[PDB]
Design an enzyme around this catalytic site. Structure first.
Site, short mmCIF file in Angstrom:
data_model
loop_
_atom_site.label_atom_id
_atom_site.label_comp_id
_atom_site.label_asym_id
_atom_site.label_seq_id
_atom_site.Cartn_x
_atom_site.Cartn_y
_atom_site.Cartn_z
N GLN A 159 10.85 2.76 4.78
CA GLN A 159 9.85 2.28 3.77
C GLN A 159 10.24 2.91 2.40
O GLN A 159 10.04 1.98 1.23
CB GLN A 159 8.32 2.37 4.00
CG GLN A 159 8.07 1.47 5.22
CD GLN A 159 8.77 1.82 6.50
OE1 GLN A 159 9.09 3.13 6.58
NE2 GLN A 159 8.59 1.10 7.34
N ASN A 160 10.65 4.13 2.27
CA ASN A 160 10.96 4.61 0.84
C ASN A 160 12.36 4.94 0.39
O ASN A 160 12.98 5.72 -0.26
CB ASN A 160 10.34 6.07 0.80
CG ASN A 160 10.34 6.98 2.03
OD1 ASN A 160 11.12 6.73 2.80
ND2 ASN A 160 9.14 7.51 2.07
N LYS A 210 11.62 7.70 5.10
CA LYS A 210 11.32 6.71 5.99
C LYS A 210 11.96 5.34 5.38
O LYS A 210 12.18 5.22 4.32
CB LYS A 210 9.83 6.60 6.70
CG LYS A 210 8.98 6.55 5.35
CD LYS A 210 7.65 5.69 5.59
CE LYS A 210 6.60 6.40 4.71
NZ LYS A 210 6.37 7.95 5.08
N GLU A 242 0.89 -1.13 -0.02
CA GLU A 242 -0.07 0.17 0.13
C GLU A 242 1.05 1.26 0.00
O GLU A 242 2.40 0.90 0.23
CB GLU A 242 -0.87 -0.11 1.05
CG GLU A 242 -2.24 0.58 1.04
CD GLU A 242 -2.80 -0.28 -0.38
OE1 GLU A 242 -2.67 0.57 -1.32
OE2 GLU A 242 -3.54 -1.45 -0.14
N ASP A 297 9.45 13.42 3.46
CA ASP A 297 9.14 12.34 4.19
C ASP A 297 9.67 10.89 4.22
O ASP A 297 9.25 9.86 3.82
CB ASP A 297 7.47 12.01 3.95
CG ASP A 297 6.93 10.83 4.68
OD1 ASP A 297 7.06 11.01 6.02
OD2 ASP A 297 5.98 10.07 4.15
N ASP A 331 13.07 -2.79 0.20
CA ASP A 331 13.09 -1.47 1.17
C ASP A 331 13.78 -1.91 2.41
O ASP A 331 14.52 -3.01 2.70
CB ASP A 331 11.76 -1.26 1.59
CG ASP A 331 11.20 -2.16 2.60
OD1 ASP A 331 11.71 -3.19 3.17
OD2 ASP A 331 9.94 -1.93 3.15
N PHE A 333 12.01 -0.54 -10.73
CA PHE A 333 11.77 -1.54 -9.74
C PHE A 333 13.00 -1.86 -8.93
O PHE A 333 13.77 -2.38 -9.69
CB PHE A 333 10.86 -2.54 -10.34
CG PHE A 333 10.67 -3.78 -9.55
CD1 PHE A 333 9.46 -3.76 -8.64
CD2 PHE A 333 11.61 -4.87 -9.33
CE1 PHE A 333 9.25 -4.97 -7.95
CE2 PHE A 333 11.24 -5.83 -8.78
CZ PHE A 333 10.02 -5.91 -7.76
N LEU A 334 12.98 -2.03 -7.60
CA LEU A 334 14.14 -2.81 -6.92
C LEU A 334 13.31 -3.61 -6.10
O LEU A 334 12.06 -3.31 -5.70
CB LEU A 334 14.59 -1.38 -5.99
CG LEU A 334 15.44 -0.33 -6.90
CD1 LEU A 334 14.46 0.50 -7.40
CD2 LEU A 334 16.20 0.29 -6.08
C1 LIG Z 1 10.46 -4.92 0.87
C2 LIG Z 1 9.28 -4.50 0.35
C3 LIG Z 1 8.56 -3.36 0.90
C4 LIG Z 1 9.45 -4.13 -1.29
C5 LIG Z 1 9.15 -2.67 -1.89
C6 LIG Z 1 9.43 -2.49 -3.06
C7 LIG Z 1 9.07 -1.18 -3.86
C8 LIG Z 1 8.69 -0.12 -2.99
C9 LIG Z 1 8.13 1.24 -3.44
N1 LIG Z 1 7.77 2.20 -2.77
C10 LIG Z 1 6.51 2.83 -2.82
C11 LIG Z 1 6.43 3.78 -1.57
O1 LIG Z 1 5.52 4.95 -2.13
C12 LIG Z 1 7.90 4.23 -1.57
O2 LIG Z 1 8.11 4.87 -0.31
C13 LIG Z 1 8.58 2.77 -1.62
C14 LIG Z 1 8.61 1.40 -5.02
C15 LIG Z 1 9.09 0.40 -5.75
C16 LIG Z 1 9.36 -0.99 -5.21
O3 LIG Z 1 9.80 -1.70 -5.85
N2 LIG Z 1 9.92 -3.69 -3.91
C17 LIG Z 1 10.20 -5.08 -3.31
N3 LIG Z 1 10.70 -5.84 -4.18
N4 LIG Z 1 9.92 -4.89 -1.97
#
Ligand SMILES: CC(C)c1cc(-c2cc(N3C[C@H](O)[C@@H](O)C3)ccc2O)nc(N)n1
Length: 279
Positions: free
Chosen positions: A123-124, A121, A12, A119, A78, A74-75
């Site tokens: 997660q980003n 964190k 999300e 912002d 996080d 794409f990676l």
């Molecule tokens: C570990 C898990 C959370 C994750 C995130 C992503 C992933 C996450 C994002 N984001 C979405 C948010 O808005 C931004 O803070 C980071 C973008 C591309 C990704 O491949 N890709 C993989 N393979 N795994």
């Protein structure tokens, strides 16, 4: 949009749901972001030129019937997942140093272009197998739940904060990689603020000029004594504690900038080790 196929829900988001997808035409794998005002349109439209190797690349923008889509590179992971996957042993300092070094490079680039993430964190912050780490969602804030990385000036109601807020967030994250615990785990705006006060000492006019004239500042704020910095991020060495301390200066103007940070003695022996991921 009909140039894609959703591989699977990935996570999300602040503004929408994120998807892994293959470009039905180039077959390439991308991160799809489903989010209107023309300002936002122009705003995020500018970001496309904001390219750097430590900034998750914004491939394209697709606005269809109220439905705004953001195509990103794409990676596979996080920093929150990486930190959990290593909670028992913790991230090897060399890697912590390299990650903080690259993130400072990425912030240095955006900041110079009068841009802020606003912002940051775990997660980003995305990582790949190569040993690189990148910044995701840069610029999105100006275009449009955790307070753990929020700078104090923000929390104090200041409405004209600088690039320094990102530095604060990074400093917070740096502390987190070292301790395996979040530095300031607030569960409300005031709780976030009291936890910062409890560790760094309730600010006053001596360490932060104009602090008391600020919007949400209250003379009734309890007066906590600053805690010797060595109890905060042990056993990070003196170079590290030195750099972290300047990233967490109360006075935003005093807080060290990304560019200056890139020259701190802490990074003198920096390298670029590969982490170990399990995709
Ligand atoms: C570990 C898990 C959370 C994750 C995130 C992503 C992933 C996450 C994002 N984001 C979405 C948010 O808005 C931004 O803070 C980071 C973008 C591309 C990704 O491949 N890709 C993989 N393979 N795994």
């Amino acid at each position: 949009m009909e140039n894609f196929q959703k591989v699977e829900k990935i996570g999300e988001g602040t503004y929408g749901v994120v998807y892994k997808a293959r470009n039905k035409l180039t077959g390439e794998v991308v991160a799809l972001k489903k989010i209107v005002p023309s300002t936002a349109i122009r705003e995020i439209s500018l970001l496309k030129e904001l390219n750097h190797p430590n900034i998750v690349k914004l491939l394209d923008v697709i606005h269809t019937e109220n439905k705004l889509y953001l195509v990103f590179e794409f990676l596979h992971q996080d920093l929150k997942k990486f930190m959990d996957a290593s909670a028992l042993t913790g991230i090897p300092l060399p890697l912590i140093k390299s990650y903080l070094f690259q993130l400072l490079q990425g912030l240095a680039f955006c900041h110079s272009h009068r841009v802020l993430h606003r912002d940051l964190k775990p997660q980003n912050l995305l990582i790949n197998t190569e040993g690189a780490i990148k910044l995701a969602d840069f610029g999105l804030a100006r275009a449009f739940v955790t307070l753990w990385y929020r700078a104090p000036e923000i929390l104090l109601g200041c409405k004209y904060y600088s690039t320094a807020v990102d530095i604060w967030s990074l400093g917070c994250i740096f502390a987190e990689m070292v301790t395996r615990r979040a530095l300031f785990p607030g569960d409300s705006e005031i709780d976030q603020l009291f936890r910062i006060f409890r560790t760094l000492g309730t600010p006053d006019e001596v360490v932060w000029p104009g602090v008391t004239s600020m919007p949400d500042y209250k003379p009734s704020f309890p007066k906590w004594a600053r805690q010797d910095f060595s109890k905060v991020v042990p056993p990070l060495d003196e170079d590290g504690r030195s750099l972290l301390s300047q990233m967490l200066h109360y006075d935003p103007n005093k807080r060290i900038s990304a560019k200056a940070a890139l020259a701190h003695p802490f990074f003198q022996d920096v390298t670029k080790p590969v982490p170990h991921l399990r995709l």
